[PDB]
Design an enzyme around this catalytic site. Structure first.
Site, PDB file in Angstrom:
ATOM      1  N   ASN A  12       0.971  -1.284   0.055  1.00 57.96           N
ATOM      2  CA  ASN A  12      -0.058   0.135  -0.146  1.00 57.96           C
ATOM      3  C   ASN A  12       0.885   1.419  -0.023  1.00 57.96           C
ATOM      4  O   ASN A  12       2.194   1.438   0.698  1.00 57.96           O
ATOM      5  CB  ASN A  12      -0.975   0.007   1.212  1.00 57.96           C
ATOM      6  N   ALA A  13       0.347   2.288  -0.820  1.00 57.62           N
ATOM      7  CA  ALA A  13       1.095   3.601  -0.330  1.00 57.62           C
ATOM      8  C   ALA A  13      -0.096   4.217   0.762  1.00 57.62           C
ATOM      9  O   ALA A  13      -1.281   4.038   0.821  1.00 57.62           O
ATOM     10  CB  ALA A  13       0.675   4.646  -1.621  1.00 57.62           C
ATOM     11  N   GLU A 144      -4.850  -9.035   3.420  1.00 57.81           N
ATOM     12  CA  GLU A 144      -5.222  -8.016   2.691  1.00 57.81           C
ATOM     13  C   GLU A 144      -5.147  -8.342   1.125  1.00 57.81           C
ATOM     14  O   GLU A 144      -5.006  -7.382   0.272  1.00 57.81           O
ATOM     15  CB  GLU A 144      -4.181  -6.789   2.907  1.00 57.81           C
ATOM     16  N   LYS A 225      -0.234 -11.526  19.786  1.00 63.09           N
ATOM     17  CA  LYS A 225       0.416 -10.355  20.059  1.00 63.09           C
ATOM     18  C   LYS A 225      -0.518  -9.535  20.793  1.00 63.09           C
ATOM     19  O   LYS A 225      -1.655  -9.134  20.452  1.00 63.09           O
ATOM     20  CB  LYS A 225       0.794  -9.557  18.710  1.00 63.09           C
ATOM     21  N   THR A 255       3.145   2.238  14.086  1.00 61.74           N
ATOM     22  CA  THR A 255       2.726   1.733  12.900  1.00 61.74           C
ATOM     23  C   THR A 255       3.843   0.726  12.200  1.00 61.74           C
ATOM     24  O   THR A 255       5.057   1.000  12.267  1.00 61.74           O
ATOM     25  CB  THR A 255       2.652   3.014  11.598  1.00 61.74           C
ATOM     26  N   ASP A 259       3.739  -5.855  12.108  1.00 62.64           N
ATOM     27  CA  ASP A 259       4.253  -6.589  10.935  1.00 62.64           C
ATOM     28  C   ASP A 259       5.707  -6.831  11.461  1.00 62.64           C
ATOM     29  O   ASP A 259       6.319  -7.861  11.096  1.00 62.64           O
ATOM     30  CB  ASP A 259       4.062  -5.499   9.915  1.00 62.64           C
ATOM     31  N   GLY A 294       7.117   5.823  10.510  1.00 70.69           N
ATOM     32  CA  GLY A 294       7.142   5.292   9.330  1.00 70.69           C
ATOM     33  C   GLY A 294       7.350   3.675   9.541  1.00 70.69           C
ATOM     34  O   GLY A 294       7.955   3.339  10.372  1.00 70.69           O
TER      35      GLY A 294
HETATM   36 NA    NA Z   1       7.417   2.639  13.434  1.00 74.40          NA
END
Ligand code: NA
Ligand code: NA
Lengths: 313, 312
Positions: A12-13, A144, A225, A255, A259, A294
């Protein structure tokens, strides 16, 4: 090469905009600022593995657009070092993207466009495509991309004997039991575990209860998690392994932490480390991830994770 | 070799998403479709000029990000053929963008990010930037970059004896009279013309009086855009010249139509065409533009406009 980490999933952007309040219907407002970053749970997980210096392939679908090039650049030879051989681009679908609106109160709000992630996959997976997953040392999936693609990939690895991990992150839809039957490790957070099984997850007993139900859905191993509350590996018929968070000096941006945690666990696992070491390694990677803004820019290198481990446990 | 159209202004990535309803705090939803397109008033007008096969430069500011690349690809060698020599990219600001959320209804919620359009310009224009406008045949401005920049440009070209058109589209604040005094042609629509005069504009006569109040503060020429009603060029010392719309066989999308109209008008004017012929040239361009979805993709090439001008 060594049997590669193979990630099949989304790219994704992420379009972040800082607003004061969510706009009303028909109303035009101004944002303080904005940023566009490479993301998507699949690209995040692949970036993580590559940064940890394990041979990593990303299998995904991009549009032939600026957002798509953004992804390729972040992941490729001038970025994280992901092998992009099996990324295919289409011209009839846009690269997937997400408008993430950061309000001033502190909450988040997200609109997701599936795009190529949901629409550019073939009805039946090519053998040419499935050969990379058949050569994997370990495979990571998320929710996704279409269930159909996920199922076909998982099954192709089943008939190959190599671990398949499904991160529950992504769509809020129920997981096809056909998919659950074909994976080795399920990896949900608290909400996803709750939402999935329907059971409450406020306490550890409750969580263990929800996991017991996952076992009955056919899943031998569950990697839960718990965000700030740490994590736990449940293996059916064995005692659970618990791991608290590795405290961060500064929580800047969570964010991609989920992952990072999952992909780092996978790297530790495919390298033959013990379950305890795997959880520790994953916790340390996630701890570093959250201290930088990010998703993909915050992915730590292996020596940093190992240094944090030395001095935190 | 002809003195170029020089457009100084904004460039935006337009992020369109089709959604059922709006999300709430701490929530994720999914959209039906989504597309990100090059836009912004400056970039649209530059694209139009280039597509009309007239030498066109765009002076603007981008971020060093994907949306910046999107713009440059739409406008440059592989796109419209705008000269991008004076487009600068910065690493501390995002390319300007707008998030357009089209709901199930027909209701649109929009978030605007000024980004580099508003924040990447220097305190004082570089002599490089002022050189291209001083060498321009005609200069186009809008109100989607800071007034300070528009003013420094407008002063330079006035000195060089180069005509300046100022599109009022953009900010809804009042126009500094330092800017009004340095432009040749002001170009509002009926709604913008009312907001900066205080007077009504639902009738022709009311418009002429508002325009009379534009001659007030030093604006000798006003190019009013009236949408379905067409357009009117008011030059003080002469009588209002007019052009109705060249009828569109089918209206698909009116986005960018005002931009096309203004740029096409500037191209006709700098080519030495008469005021009447300028309005007709612009009307023809605007006509072809509304028959195609999008703004930049709907810009007509010179041959399509000149073929439509052969007709009635
Ligand atoms: Na981060
Ligand atoms: Na159009």
């Amino acid at each position: 090469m060594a049997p590669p980490l193979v990630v099949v999933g989304s790219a994704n952007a992420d379009i972040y905009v800082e607003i004061e309040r969510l706009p009303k219907e028909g109303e035009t407002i101004s944002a303080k600022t904005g940023q566009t970053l490479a993301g998507g749970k699949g690209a995040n997980q692949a970036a993580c593995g590559a940064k940890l210096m394990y041979p990593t392939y990303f299998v995904g679908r991009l549009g032939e657009d600026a957002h798509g090039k953004l992804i390729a650049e972040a992941l490729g030879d001038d970025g994280c070092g992901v092998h992009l051989d099996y990324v295919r681009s289409v011209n009839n679908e846009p690269t997937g993207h997400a408008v993430v609106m950061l309000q001033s109160d502190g909450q988040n709000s997200i609109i997701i466009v599936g795009g190529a992630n949901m629409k550019a996959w073939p009805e039946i997976m090519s053998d040419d495509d499935l050969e990379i997953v058949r050569n994997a040392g370990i495979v990571l999936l998320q929710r996704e991309i279409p269930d159909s693609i996920n199922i076909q990939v998982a099954k192709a690895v089943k008939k190959a004997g190599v671990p398949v991990i499904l991160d529950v992150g992504g769509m809020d839809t129920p997981i096809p039991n056909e998919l659950l039957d074909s994976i080795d490790i399920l990896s949900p957070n608290e909400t996803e575990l709750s939402r999935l099984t329907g059971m409450p997850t406020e306490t550890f007993e409750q969580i263990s209860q929800a996991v017991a139900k996952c076992h009955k859905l056919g899943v031998k191993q569950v990697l839960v998690k718990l965000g700030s509350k740490g994590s736990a590996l449940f293996i059916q018929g064995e005692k659970p392994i618990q791991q608290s968070i590795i405290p961060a000096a500064q929580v800047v941006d969570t964010t991609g932490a989920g992952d990072t945690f999952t992909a780092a666990f996978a790297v530790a696992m495919v390298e033959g480390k013990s379950h305890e070491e795997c959880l520790r390694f994953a916790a340390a990677a996630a701890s570093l991830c959250v201290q930088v803004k990010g998703a993909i820019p915050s992915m730590p290198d292996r020596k940093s994770v190992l240094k944090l481990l030395k001095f935190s446990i």
